[PDB]
């Protein structure tokens, strides 16, 4: 229902001369774009990554980003000189920008900046601001960045208008990929006077899934789900473990429910 669109930028500045900026774009948990430092242009990672933008709208948007990447790089380098010797290389900067799409024509846009892995700055309303916990020295950069009316006007338009418009078109164009159903496949195993049973579940999309160890109709509340781990083919992997006394594994089963199975649960008995 609700999809978050995330443009993620990672910038490493090793010293005065050396830097690289790499970007990836996500709609939900599917990658739509990639922009390597080595590349002059943004890469589509889906057929529908241009959304409903004409080639002229896309070119114009890409151009804006190309100017931004070069300008951003120089601005950081100059901001470091401005604050010296308070801050020094190496420096990591991350940006997380995009919008969250709600039913209607409702959306919330965001642009969050991290310095050395800590959220310190956002764009809010019509200006850059520091967030709670940020060090006081950032007040000078913020002042300098807020002097640039031109950037403020461009970012407002990107966040308020361009992002929701673009993503609406993406959702339309990419509907069949976003709504795909991929079936989980399960298999069982064990490791170490106690034993750990493992229910492996792999290849399911979308993410929501239910996995429980059973004895008949009784859920084993000792069941521990791990994290969702990605496969390379944009499906998910998950394992559920149950710690049990050895020679007690008789009549235990692993039950898996997922939207893709259409009522036919997977049940694997040990």
């Amino acid at each position, epitope marked *: 229902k609700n999809y978050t669109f995330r443009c993620l930028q990672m910038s490493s500045f090793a010293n005065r001369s050396w830097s690289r900026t790499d970007s990836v774009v996500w709609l939900g948990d599917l990658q739509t774009h990639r922009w390597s430092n080595d590349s002059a242009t943004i890469s589509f990672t889906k057929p529908w990554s241009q959304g409903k933008l004409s080639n002229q709208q896309w070119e114009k948007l890409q151009h804006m980003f190309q*100017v931004y990447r070069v*300008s951003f790089t*120089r*601005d950081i380098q*100059e*901001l470091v*000189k*401005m604050m*010296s010797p308070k801050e020094d290389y190496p420096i990591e900067i991350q940006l997380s920008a995009g919008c969250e799409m709600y039913p209607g024509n409702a959306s919330e846009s965001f642009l969050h900046v991290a310095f050395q892995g800590k959220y310190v700055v956002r764009f809010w309303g019509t200006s850059w601001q520091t967030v709670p916990g940020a060090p006081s020295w950032l007040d000078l950069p913020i*002042k*300098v*960045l*807020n*002097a*640039d*009316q*031109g*950037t403020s006007a461009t970012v407002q338009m990107l966040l308020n208008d361009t992002c929701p418009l673009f993503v609406r078109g993406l959702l339309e164009a990419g509907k069949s990929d976003l709504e795909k159903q991929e079936k989980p496949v399960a298999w069982l195993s064990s490791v170490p006077g106690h034993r750990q049973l493992v229910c492996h579940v792999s290849g399911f999309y979308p993410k929501p899934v239910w996995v429980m160890w059973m004895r008949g109709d009784q859920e084993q509340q000792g069941t521990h789900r791990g994290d969702f781990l990605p496969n390379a083919d944009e499906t998910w992997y998950l394992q559920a473990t149950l710690d049990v006394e050895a020679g007690e594994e008789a009549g235990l089963a692993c039950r898996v429910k997922h939207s893709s199975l259409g009522g036919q649960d997977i049940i694997l008995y040990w």
Partner: T-cell receptor, first 114, second 111 residues
Framework: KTQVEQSPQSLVVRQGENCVLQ??????????LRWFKQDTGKGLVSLTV?????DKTSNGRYSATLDKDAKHSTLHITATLLDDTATYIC?????????????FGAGTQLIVIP | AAVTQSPRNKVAVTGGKVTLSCNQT?????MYWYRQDTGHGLRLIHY???????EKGDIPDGYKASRPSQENFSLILELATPSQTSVYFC??????????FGPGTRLLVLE
């Protein structure tokens, strides 16, 4: 050879005549463009600053245009006077803040015959 | 916002030490040194974002910069050469893009 080019290099006009000065640039990004007047052996006097995609400004007898799509600016002097005898310099700022560098044209020399 | 330069005119010898000074009472953090030569636009030599900060510009070779205070920014030619015969312009600014130029300094380095 450079990112800001002015034309003509020089020109001679008679008092009361109008003239047009040109500035072409390749600077990116182009936040704004300023025209300077430099009397012989003197400093830089700002005539106008252009900021919009398709901008127009005026300052008495001086008027100016900017076309950011073409990266082109003209300075118009109406009814030249003797005191317009000067070098006219075009400058492009690449930021709307102090993080910017200025890119200076080499200038156009105007002589007004009284 | 006003900027002053001293000296306004200087004749020097090759190998001599020349210091060009710029004073600025606007409490501007940022100051900038340029030279102007016939056939060229102003070119950036050195700049400063504050007391103790000096940064290399586009053509820094043969020059040293010095920012002992918010008010004063100096350009030092340790071993003057005839190639440094020029007109030198200092400027100051705050966080905005405007640089406020001084009246210029003429330097002639004789053999």
């Amino acid at each position: 050879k450079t990112q800001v080019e002015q034309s003509p290099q020089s020109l001679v006009v008679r008092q009361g005549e109008n003239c047009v000065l040109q500035c072409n640039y390749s600077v990116t990004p182009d936040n704004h463009l300023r025209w300077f007047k430099q009397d012989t052996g003197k400093g830089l006097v700002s005539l106008t600053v252009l900021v919009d995609q398709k901008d127009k400004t005026s300052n008495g007898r001086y008027s100016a245009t900017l076309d950011k799509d073409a990266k082109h600016s003209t300075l118009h002097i109406t009814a030249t006077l003797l005191d317009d005898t000067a070098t006219y310099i075009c400058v492009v700022g690449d930021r709307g803040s102090a993080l910017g560098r200025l890119h200076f044209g080499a200038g156009t020399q105007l002589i007004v015959i009284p | 916002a006003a900027v002053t330069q001293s000296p306004r005119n200087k004749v020097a010898v090759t190998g001599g030490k020349v210091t060009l000074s710029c004073n600025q009472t606007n409490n501007h953090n940022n100051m900038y040194w340029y030279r102007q030569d016939t056939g060229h636009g102003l070119r950036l030599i050195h700049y400063s974002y504050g007391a103790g900060s000096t940064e290399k510009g586009d053509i820094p070779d043969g020059y040293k910069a010095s920012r002992p205070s918010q008010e004063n920014f100096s350009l030092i030619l340790e071993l003057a050469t005839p190639s440094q015969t020029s007109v030198y312009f200092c400027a100051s600014g705050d966080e905005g893009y405007t640089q406020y130029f001084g009246p210029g300094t003429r330097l002639l380095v004789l053999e």
